[PDB]
Amino acid sequence: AKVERPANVPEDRVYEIDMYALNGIEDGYHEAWKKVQHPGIPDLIWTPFTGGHWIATNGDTVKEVYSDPTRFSSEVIFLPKEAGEKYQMVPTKMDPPEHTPYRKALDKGLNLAKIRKVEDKVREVASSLIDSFAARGECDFAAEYAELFPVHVFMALADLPLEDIPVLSEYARQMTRPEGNTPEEMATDLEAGNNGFYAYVDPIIRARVGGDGDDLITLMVNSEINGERIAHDKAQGLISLLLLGGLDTVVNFLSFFMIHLARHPELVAELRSDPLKLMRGAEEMFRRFPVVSEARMVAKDQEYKGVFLKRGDMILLPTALHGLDDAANPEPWKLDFSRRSISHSTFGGGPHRCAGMHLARMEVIVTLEEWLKRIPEFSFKEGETPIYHSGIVAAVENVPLVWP
Ligand code: HEM
Ligand SMILES: CC1(C)[C@@H]2CC[C@@]1(C)C(=O)C2
């Protein structure tokens, strides 16, 4: 399903790239994106796949598109456009100034200082999951840690009974990874999850208004937007985005770095010997394993990167192409915990820059600490290979790990 080349796209910028099926995906998500970014590739290219869209191809251009809501709007942030148009969320769809009060509400539950207080609960999630299989000498990391860890953290931050994990996990799967052989069946799957989650938190929102708790739900529902308490449905959208933001990004991120560490025993030893360098190299991991490739909509007609972009045009942002850009970071493939200038867009940029980034950093550091306390050496099961997918959030599964 290819679209005709528009008059604003120069023929010499056309690349046949399908963001949902990159060539060579089966050798690695990051590898597949990097093989797109050949030497001398224009800053902005264009593909007829996925409705037809531009693609930012380096760190400089990814950074720039993220930073400027005036020129590149969040009105549509994913591809294809007709799906992204149809599936907006609060406040990822807003530009400033509308966005601002909603981000302020988000920041109440996610700021650096608030996240510090939550470390004990996160650590306890990490240690319990790990304690399940540490004695076994083997596990599927994706299935037995990565897929479970985020939902458990959410329960703790949102103050929700742990026995609701099964129903919330079901809704999570449907909301983050819809299935369907028609876009209609896919639409059904998404609705199941979105409305199911809505029904689930609805009585908790109501019970928590005027409440004294410092969980995520009470913090969102008692936020003020423009001088008055946040609308019921807006608080619902926030709480939903809080579940979502912290799920698929982390599930997959965790596996990508555990895979690499399985295959790099000498880095594992390094981190084991130096827990200050462990703690301080979360940032290097974020650079090396980006997972998001969402989009911006061109907000108005304009010249950019030597082309004329039309209002309504879409620009795909492969965050892999900033972290792994050797113009941005010399020798980018090396996971280097002493790296001096760690340049990346793994959490976006501009006003929407991941509100969850302090939590992300803490989840990663704590996972790595708890893991190494119990499993100081490990590797990838012989004869096995991960399975990769490309899309809005990179997917990896099948991560059999083994240890003495
Ligand atoms: C590896 C971990 C993570 C990655 C790579 C990641 C990535 C991103 C990116 C690229 C954005 C910007 C979206 C845009 O501008 O359109 C974002 C936004 C957001 N993330 Fe994260 N995220 C991660 C973890 C988390 C966690 C743990 C949470 C906690 C729930 C979270 C919650 C959010 C929220 C609420 C936003 C929207 C902020 C806004 O629009 O102002 N994320 N994330
Ligand atoms: C995965 C997303 C594209 C979607 C909107 C922003 C993003 C990073 C999320 O937090 C959910």
UniProtKB/TrEMBL annotation:
Keyword Heme: yes
Keywords, alphabetical: Heme, Iron, Metal-binding, Monooxygenase, Oxidoreductase
UniProt-listed Pfam families: p450 (PF00067)
Record GO terms (molecular function): heme binding; iron ion binding; monooxygenase activity; oxidoreductase activity, acting on paired donors, with incorporation or reduction of molecular oxygen
Positions annotated to bind heme b: Y66, R103, R296, H352, C354
CDD domains: P450cam-like
Family indicated by similarity: Belongs to the cytochrome P450 family.
Protein name per UniProt: Cytochrome P450
